[PDB]
Amino acid sequence: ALLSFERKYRVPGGTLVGGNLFDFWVGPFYVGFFGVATFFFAALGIILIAWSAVLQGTWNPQLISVYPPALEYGLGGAPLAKGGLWQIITICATGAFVSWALREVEICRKLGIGYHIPFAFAFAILAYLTLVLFRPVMMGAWGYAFPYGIWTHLDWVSNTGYTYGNFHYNPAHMIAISFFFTNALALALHGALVLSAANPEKGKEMRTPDHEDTFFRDLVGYSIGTLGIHRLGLLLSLSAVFFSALCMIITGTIWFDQWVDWWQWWVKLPWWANIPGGING
Amino acid sequence: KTNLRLWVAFQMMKGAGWAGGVFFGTLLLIGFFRVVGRMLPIQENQAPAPNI
Amino acid sequence: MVGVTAFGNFDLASLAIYSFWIFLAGLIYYLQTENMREGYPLENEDGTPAANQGPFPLPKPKTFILPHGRGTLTVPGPESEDRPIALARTAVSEGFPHAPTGDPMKDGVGPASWVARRDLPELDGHGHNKIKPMKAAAGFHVSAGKNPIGLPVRGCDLEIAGKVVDIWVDIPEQMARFLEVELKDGSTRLLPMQMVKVQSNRVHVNALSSDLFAGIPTIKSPTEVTLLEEDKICGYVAGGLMYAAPK
Amino acid sequence: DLGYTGLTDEQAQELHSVYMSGLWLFSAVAIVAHLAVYIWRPWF
Amino acid sequence: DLGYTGLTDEQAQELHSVYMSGLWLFSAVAIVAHLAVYIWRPWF
Amino acid sequence: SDLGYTGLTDEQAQELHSVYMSGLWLFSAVAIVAHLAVYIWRPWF
Amino acid sequence: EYQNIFSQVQVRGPADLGMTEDVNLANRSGVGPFSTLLGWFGNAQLGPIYLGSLGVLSLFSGLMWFFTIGIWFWYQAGWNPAVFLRDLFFFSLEPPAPEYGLSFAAPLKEGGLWLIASFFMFVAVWSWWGRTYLRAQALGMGKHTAWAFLSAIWLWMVLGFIRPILMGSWSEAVPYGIFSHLDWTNNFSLVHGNLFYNPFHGLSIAFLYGSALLFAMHGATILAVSRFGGERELEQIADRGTAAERAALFWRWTMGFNATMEGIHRWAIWMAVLVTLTGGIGILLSGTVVDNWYVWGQNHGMAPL
Amino acid sequence: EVSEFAFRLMMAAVIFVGVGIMFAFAGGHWFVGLVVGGLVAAFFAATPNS
Amino acid sequence: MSKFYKIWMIFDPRRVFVAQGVFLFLLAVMIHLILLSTPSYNWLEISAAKYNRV
Amino acid sequence: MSKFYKIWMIFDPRRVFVAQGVFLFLLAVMIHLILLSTPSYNWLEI
Amino acid sequence: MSKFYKIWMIFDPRRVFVAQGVFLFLLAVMIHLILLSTPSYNWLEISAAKYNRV
Amino acid sequence: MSKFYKIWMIFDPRRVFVAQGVFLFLLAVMIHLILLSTPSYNWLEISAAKYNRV
Amino acid sequence: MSKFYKIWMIFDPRRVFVAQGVFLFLLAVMIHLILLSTPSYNWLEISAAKYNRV
Amino acid sequence: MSKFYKIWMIFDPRRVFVAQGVFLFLLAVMIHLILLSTPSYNWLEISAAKYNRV
Ligand SMILES: CCCCCCCCCCCCCCCCCC(=O)OC[C@H](COP(=O)([O-])OCC(O)COP(=O)([O-])OC[C@@H](COC(=O)CCCCCCCCCCCCCCCCC)OC(=O)CCCCCCCCCCCCCCCCC)OC(=O)CCCCCCCCCCCCCCCCC
Ligand code: BCL
Ligand SMILES: COC(C)(C)C/C=C/C(C)=C/C=C/C(C)=C/C=C/C(C)=C/C=C/C=C(C)/C=C/C=C(\C)CC/C=C(\C)CCC=C(C)C
Ligand SMILES: COC(C)(C)C/C=C/C(C)=C/C=C/C(C)=C/C=C/C(C)=C/C=C/C=C(C)/C=C/C=C(\C)CC/C=C(\C)CCC=C(C)C
Ligand SMILES: COC(C)(C)C/C=C/C(C)=C/C=C/C(C)=C/C=C/C(C)=C/C=C\C=C(C)\C=C\C=C(/C)CC/C=C(\C)CCC=C(C)C
Ligand SMILES: [Fe+2]
């Protein structure tokens, strides 16, 4: 049931809504008010996905798809089998995510730690809400959101990208991709470095943080440190998600053409616009 | 006990009012995004349906 | 090799994807087994071993050789709390919280908990103490921030609790770790630097009220702090957030 | 008397009396609203 | 004699008595609603 | 010996199992009546 | 209120030259300047950098690769600095034309200079991998960085060397440009059906999103427990403190299971090497085994058909 | 209360917008305004007054 | 059957009642949504067709 | 309903009242949006 | 098979009861959803066709 | 063959029993899904064609 | 060859048995799937053709 | 040639045995798949053509 050190940390406090009510555990999980809310919303969403699969006529989990209402419905209700189920599942998914974040806040303040994890999760919730709520609401219909299917939401990604030509000409897209790639690189380097210090050559003593500092100072000439690397990882991940949300929110609302055409403002700058050479001349 | 009645009412109202404030705040946010999309030139330039 | 299937629709892509599924299952098993080297076996709330232990078996022991003759550490191994926990059950059934018997910040339970770490100072790669007061550290100085030395210290109750006299610095990382705060009675306490906000004319400690500053665990040697003392101090200061909410 | 809450038997009885009062008043209000909606536009 | 919750035999017996009362009330309401729906529109 | 992991003796295990079997047989009987009703209504063989 | 995102006081002392396990100290340099901005975010010290034989090899080859691409860009610009700045991101070294196959007979303007730059880049990257291995060895550490870099190298080699040889043409390889290699990836997806329907593409994307997820989670956790000295993880491994315990209990009460201060780093390294490894496999499969990934998905229950 | 860094950032943002519109009018292009305003704003914000 | 009260010897009533409320409300909402999904037994559309509201 | 009052010796009345207010409001909102999404009963439309 | 009660000396009854309750509910929902997916056993559609409901 | 009982000295009964239960359930479900996927052993369609349920 | 028992002084018997069980079950499933994918040796389709169940 | 036993004083037997088993199984499976891919040696197709199972 409990870890060898878990007992002293299970104390009665730190809830947001309710008191001793819902202040208990179910196995390893902590189930507060928002634990109950999260469970309800998640179970409802999963059963509604299965019922949509029943309606669609397929049991293959890779072919199950829940489609948003067609564009003719705008931002109003739709029949359940023709977009209503998607809307109900969206409400359930939003509720599950927000209740999960609030449950994490309750756990944070029961353990006395800072609230960095719920904040980081809220960034992802905002990216999901950008894709499913803010952009469709600005664009005028629920049908600009993506369907709930393993391989059909990828169809949404493909069609939405190819509406605006080649999509990685969107600048904020370029920034987001750079952040994602840099984050994966930093994560690999960080995990490898910590493991190599903790697992040296056979028969050696454990290395110290001085050895890690020395390893990267020998390699690249700079070491950011332990606090530095953790701050860097958090900020790289959050900046990637923030810039992806931005590049999508400006996509069908401010921009309407091919992005490769957006890049012509640099070429048409007045002082080199007409110089006869190179690619654009 | 009348004070007991009013206390039950006060707790019920507290829960309902917090929930209502949150829900109406979200509804106002939705109205905000809808209106600022109305001001945008979306009506002129409309994208095709991405779900097929 | 395009369209070349061994049977059915099974081609090199299908072979690769099934091989990867098997590899991924094995890798997840390995990763969880390696995660299972601390806090196991699982226990009942009365301390005895739990009937249910989990799907993953306990890994074989592995040994770390600690630097500077600090010994070895074999994990998984026999781990005991080695300290009394002043908590009482609130229910016979499991899954419910345990209530502090007395003063939770004094007793060190809940968000004020601390672990019986080694009673030695943490060392750098050369054998010297990792953390030193800035007066002991030769050649160290405050470079580019608001210097806190001399600033009043204010608790969460809008009252002055003392003044900053020194900064304790992590020599290898070259970063500030603790603020040394002298109280009214001429005694010094250490505050984690992650728990104080250095403002223009004060240092604000939101976790702790002015009176509670007296109860911060002290260090037995003025020139160094051991890992156990760091846990005691940080646990007390962090538990102040929950257990000093009134006043 | 399990008593996980600290209320005695009589306190629970009194509080349940007031809670039943509120539940029936709420039921009456909901019933009259339903009757109004059913007269305006029946759903059966 | 076996105990995981701290309830005595009589305490559990009384809890089960009232829990059965609530269960039978809920089920009777469910039967009446089902009979009403079936008379309104049968599903067999 | 006992070979106990849960701390239950033989007598407690027997009493628990007897009550569990009572519940299982009631659940199974209800399932059998449901299957009879369905099979009369619409046989699947 | 302090979130420990930026340092609020910054202290400087004597520079740290590092450890001397068995490193050849003659091959090191001096310490560089201190930087206050880096001090705000992380460490302020710059250097000393090790530069031995493998470093000279890597620097020479990478410098020659960069110089070859830059001189080609200058040739395309017509030796005009204004055109060079304007059409930067538009210049590119293209690989040979498909008629030449794998042969080394393509002209310098067509694809020969691309081959020269590619040789320089190959030497530079492999010598840098050797350098990471040897720098880990000199200090007595394990070689985890070398094998993670080997995963990254595997994807790079598949993209530029292995797949062109299996396809039998250098024209299959990536151009050296900014917009040009982006156009290359778009055309690669278009020629091979839909790369969304490559399953190893899907796994690679899963593990990229997983790297972002995991390392936001882990950075946030370490920052949250750093009030207990959680960022000094190497000693939380040796002496478990309240920081590691609180982190484990947060994640166990949240999602039912947790890690150690070392197992989480095993998770991290594997989550990143997996994105690059699955990507390499998926790219190697494209064109050699599957020429149309959407049709493959239709035959494998992934598309409605 | 607000920090000196926070004040520098507010005034840097307003200076950025101001000088940006200013030099986007002066120059023919918005990029000139963006460059000049961003350089001035970075210099202003990188030098807190305390 | 007469011995079922001993379920409260295993399970504390607080968690059981919480879980049972969650389960019962979830099942009720599930069945109502399933009925609303079908053309028949969608009582709103049945009413609209019966009273020619359109 | 003979001994239903004993539920208040199981749960804290204050917290039950707050949670029940939340539940009742969210149920009302659910039913109202179900009604609005239907072409009939959409009182705002009429 | 007269000594099956000894399974309760191996497994804790509370874990078993919770896990088997979840298993039985999920199995029931699975079978019902399968039957609803089959047009010849979807009782809602059967009743709609039997009573001429369109 | 008469020494197979010593397997319980090698293996912990709790994990063996849990893994065996999960494996048996998953194998039964897999075989049932295989049978439902084949038109000639889908007993629901077979009943739908024997009894004229169009 | 009579001294193969010494493998058990090299390999942990419990790890070997688990690896062997997983290996054997996966091999058996793979061979059965191969036989099901070949129109000859798909016993369900062979029986369907034999008894004219299509 | 009669001193090859000395290989076991520089290689640990457990590593060698595990690597050898994994390598042997992978090699055999690869060769079997290669033969099944070639129509000349796909024994499941040769048997079908021999006994006219089409
Ligand atoms: C039936 C099919 C299914 C197959 C599998 C199914 C079998 C059942 C499941 C098995 C799964 C088990 C997974 C558990 C592994 C975890 C082990 C571990 O992490 O710690 C132990 C051990 C060290 O633990 P430690 O406690 O940290 O040691 C500290 C030491 O004291 C001091 O440190 P050190 O100096 O000893 O070294 C530290 C390092 C050390 O570990 C190593 O030494 C790894 C060696 C490099 C990988 C080998 C490939 C290199 C090419 C071969 C040439 C060199 C070979 C000789 C290597 C030298 C070794 C002496 O440990 C690490 O943690 C590194 C982690 C990151 C490794 C990433 C390597 C990726 C390289 C990319 C290669 C791409 C080319 C081909 C791609 C595939 C082709 C299609 O590390 C390893 O053993 C790593 C294993 C490497 C796995 C290689 C990948 C397989 C890829 C297959 C993908 C699926 C196929 C689908 C496609 C099919 C196409 C048709
Ligand atoms: C129209 C475009 C296509 C498409 C075409 C491709 C193609 C083509 C490929 C990918 C690949 C990938 N794509 Mg895709 N991709 C699409 C849509 C998506 C979407 C999305 C939401 O829509 C996502 C999230 C992704 C995500 C991904 C990544 C998971 C993956 C690249 C891993 C990586 O780090 O590479 C970047 C890392 C490297 C290339 C490794 C570099 C290592 C070497 C050693 C570095 C040398 C540096 C040199 C020396 C530098 C000098 C530097 C100075 C020192 C500073 N794609 C669509 C369908 N994508 C790749 C893959 O593996 O696919 C299976 C790939 O090749
Ligand atoms: C897709 O599948 C479909 C939907 C088509 C069909 C599939 C369906 C399923 C799987 C349906 C599930 C049916 C089930 C399994 C229903 C469960 C019904 C139950 C078990 C209901 C419980 C009713 C019990 C009720 C309300 C509680 C009555 C309890 C009380 C008022 C409270 C007791 C008061 C007390 C105890 C005081 C105790 C304190 C002291 C001090 C004595
Ligand atoms: C796709 O494949 C399909 C679905 C088509 C077909 C495949 C199908 C399968 C795989 C079906 C599986 C069927 C199974 C495996 C069903 C399991 C049925 C069981 C095993 C049910 C158990 C019922 C037990 C019940 C209700 C419990 C009654 C227990 C009690 C009340 C508990 C009482 C015991 C007690 C209280 C303790 C008291 C004693 C003391 C001393 C305190
Ligand atoms: C004023 O500025 C100066 C002129 C001083 C320098 C400024 C320079 C510029 C503007 C440099 C441009 C650098 C750029 C824009 C580089 C683009 C680099 C990219 C983005 C490469 C992208 C994908 C490249 C990939 C996968 C390369 C894979 C390459 C390989 C494995 C190497 C293959 C090695 C082999 C092919 C050929 C084998 C032949 C022999 C003899 C071994
Ligand atoms: Fe870390």
Author numbering:
A (entry chain L): 1 to 281
B (entry chain X): 16 to 67
C (entry chain H): 1 to 247
D (entry chain 8), E (entry chain 0): 6 to 49
F (entry chain B): 5 to 49
G (entry chain M): 2 to 306
H (entry chain Y): 3 to 52
I (entry chain 9), K (entry chain A), L (entry chain D), M (entry chain F), N (entry chain I): 1 to 54
Kindly provide excerpts from the paper associated with this entry:
The reaction center (RC) and light-harvesting complex 1 (LH1) form a RC–LH1 core supercomplex that is vital for the primary reactions of photosynthesis in purple phototrophic bacteria. The RC–LH1 supercomplex comprises an RC surrounded by the LH1 ring that is made of multiple αβ-heterodimers. LH1 collects photons directly from sunlight or from the peripheral antenna, light-harvesting complex 2 (LH2), and transfers excitation energy to the RC. In contrast, some Rhodobacter species, such as Rba. sphaeroides, possess dimeric RC–LH1 core structures, representing the largest photosynthetic complex in anoxygenic phototrophs.
